[PDB]
C-alpha cells in the first residue's frame, strides 16, 4: 500500500478492512485522532463536506479570477466581491444572512439526522413524497437518487476511482483556499496576480522576499 512516509509505521486503526475501504487512505495520522471508529466515521463525514464546499469555493475564486484577465467577465477581486455585490443587490446583508441560515439549517439538519441514523430520512409519510429517494446508498456520505442525476454512480468498476479523484482534488482545494487567505494577508493582491508576478521573476518574488512570511531572515 501507499503511505505518506515510506518506512513509517502505519497506525493500527488505519490498518483495518473498515479503514482501508475509505477513499484516499494514505496512513496519515501523526496526531492519533482517529482511535475511535465512530470518531473516524464522523471525521470522514467532515472531510467529505469540507472537500465539496472547498472545491466549490475555490472554483468560484479561480474561474472568474482567470477569465477576468481575458476580455469578458469583469469580476472584482474575491476579497471585495461582497461589497460590490451588496451594492448591486436589493437587500441588506443581515436579511440575506438570516435567510441563508434558515435554508441551510434545514438541509444540514436533514443530513445530520442521516448521520446519526443511516436509514432515517426515508420513512413513510415524513415528507410529501421525496421520502422515496432520501435514503442512503449503503455508504454514508454518498447518497443517490436526486443526487448524481447523470447515473455516473451506477457502474461498480469506476467506483473507487471516482471516490479517490474526489478526495484528492478536495484536499488540494482546501490547500488552495488556505493559500488564498495567506496570499491575501501577505502580498496584498489577487491570486492570479501573484501567479503572474511569480512567473515573471521566480528567483526574486516568493515568500522569502515578501518580508512578512519569515521576518527573522
Amino acid at each position: 500500500r501507499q503511505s505518506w512516509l515510506p518506512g513509517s509505521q502505519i497506525p493500527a486503526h488505519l490498518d483495518t478492512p473498515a479503514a482501508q475501504a475509505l477513499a484516499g487512505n494514505f496512513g496519515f495520522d501523526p496526531l492519533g485522532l482517529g482511535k475511535d471508529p465512530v470518531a473516524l466515521r464522523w471525521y470522514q463525514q467532515a472531510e467529505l463536506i469540507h472537500c465539496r464546499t472547498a472545491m466549490a469555493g475555490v472554483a468560484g475564486i479561480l474561474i472568474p479570477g482567470l477569465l477576468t484577465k481575458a476580455g469578458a467577465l469583469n469580476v472584482p477581486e474575491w476579497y471585495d466581491a461582497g461589497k460590490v455585490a451588496i451594492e448591486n443587490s436589493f437587500a441588506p446583508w443581515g436579511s440575506l444572512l438570516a435567510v441563508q441560515l434558515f435554508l441551510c439549517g434545514f438541509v444540514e439538519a436533514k443530513r445530520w439526522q442521516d448521520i446519526r441514523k443511516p436509514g432515517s430520512q426515508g420513512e413513510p409519510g415524513s415528507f410529501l413524497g421525496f421520502e422515496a429517494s432520501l435514503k442512503g446508498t449503503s455508504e454514508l456520505g454518498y447518497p443517490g437518487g436526486p443526487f448524481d442525476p447523470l447515473g455516473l454512480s451506477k457502474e461498480a468498476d469506476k467506483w473507487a476511482d471516482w471516490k479517490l479523484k474526489e478526495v484528492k482534488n478536495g484536499r488540494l482545494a482546501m490547500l488552495a483556499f488556505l493559500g488564498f487567505v495567506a496570499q491575501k494577508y501577505a502580498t496584498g493582491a489577487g491570486p492570479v496576480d501573484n501567479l503572474a508576478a511569480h512567473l515573471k521573476d521566480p528567483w526574486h518574488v516568493n515568500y522569502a522576499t515578501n518580508g512578512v512570511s519569515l521576518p527573522f531572515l
Partner: protein, 212 residues
C-alpha cells in the same frame, strides 16, 4: 593484537575491530549501547564526508587565491558570490533546506527501517535506494563505478582509507577555523608565512595562542 590508540591499555568491550578505523578509542564510553554505537558510526561517516569535501574546497580556493586569479578567501566567498551575481540570500537558503531535507529525510527513515526505501515509492526506483550496510548506501547512484561489489578485501581497505582520511579532514577543517580566528589571514597564506620563517612564525608567536 590490534594497534590501539594508547599502547598498553586493552580496548573496551564494545569495540572489537569489525568496524573501520577501530582503534579502541572511547574513554567516556559514549558508544556502549549497540544502537547508539550504530548511530554514531553513521554520524562519523557523514561528518567525515562533509569535512573531506569542505577541506578540498578550502585548499583549492586558497591555491587559486594566492596566485593572482581573483578568488576570494573562504571567509569572504559567501558575501561576494551572493552580492556579485544577483542572488537573494534567503531563497537560496530555503532551496537548500528543500533539497537537503528531502535527501536527508530519506537517509533518516532508511536508518529507522533498514530496507524500506527499496519499495518503489520514489518515482520508479527499486534496489537503487537499498542500503548495503550502515552508512554505506552503495547502489547505482552512490557507487556508479562499482567498487563495493568486487574485491571484498580490497573494499575493506577502501573503508579503512575513507575513515582515516575523513578524520584527518575533520581536524583539518577545525584547523582552518581556529587558524583564521587566531591570525585573521588565509590558510595557505599562513602556510607560506610559516614556510618562509619556520623558527619565528608559528603559534607560539601570535600572542593569541599562548597568553603568557
Amino acid at each position: 593484537v590490534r594497534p590501539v590508540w594508547f599502547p598498553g591499555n586493552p580496548p573496551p568491550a564494545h569495540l572489537d575491530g569489525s568496524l573501520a578505523g577501530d582503534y579502541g578509542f572511547d574513554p567516556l564510553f559514549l558508544g556502549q549501547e549497540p544502537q547508539t554505537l550504530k548511530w554514531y558510526v553513521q554520524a562519523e561517516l557523514v561528518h567525515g564526508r562533509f569535512a573531506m569535501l569542505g577541506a578540498a574546497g578550502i585548499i583549492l580556493t586558497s591555491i587559486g587565491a594566492k596566485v593572482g586569479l581573483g578568488f576570494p578567501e573562504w571567509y569572504d566567498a559567501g558575501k561576494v558570490v551572493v552580492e556579485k551575481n544577483n542572488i537573494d540570500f534567503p531563497t537560496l537558503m530555503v532551496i537548500q533546506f528543500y533539497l537537503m531535507g528531502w535527501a536527508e529525510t530519506k537517509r533518516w527513515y532508511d536508518f529507522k527501517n533498514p530496507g524500506s526505501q527499496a519499495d518503489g515509492s520514489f518515482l520508479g526506483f527499486t534496489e537503487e535506494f537499498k542500503g548495503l550496510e550502515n552508512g554505506y548506501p552503495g547502489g547505482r547512484f552512490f557507487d556508479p563505478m562499482g567498487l563495493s561489489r568486487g574485491d571484498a578485501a580490497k573494499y575493506q581497505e577502501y573503508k579503512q582509507k575513507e575513515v582515516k582520511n575523513g578524520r584527518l579532514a575533520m581536524i583539518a577543517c577545525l584547523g582552518f577555523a581556529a587558524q583564521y580566528a587566531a591570525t585573521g589571514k588565509g590558510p595557505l597564506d599562513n602556510l607560506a608565512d610559516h614556510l618562509a620563517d619556520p623558527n619565528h612564525v608559528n603559534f607560539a608567536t601570535n600572542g593569541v595562542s599562548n597568553p603568557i
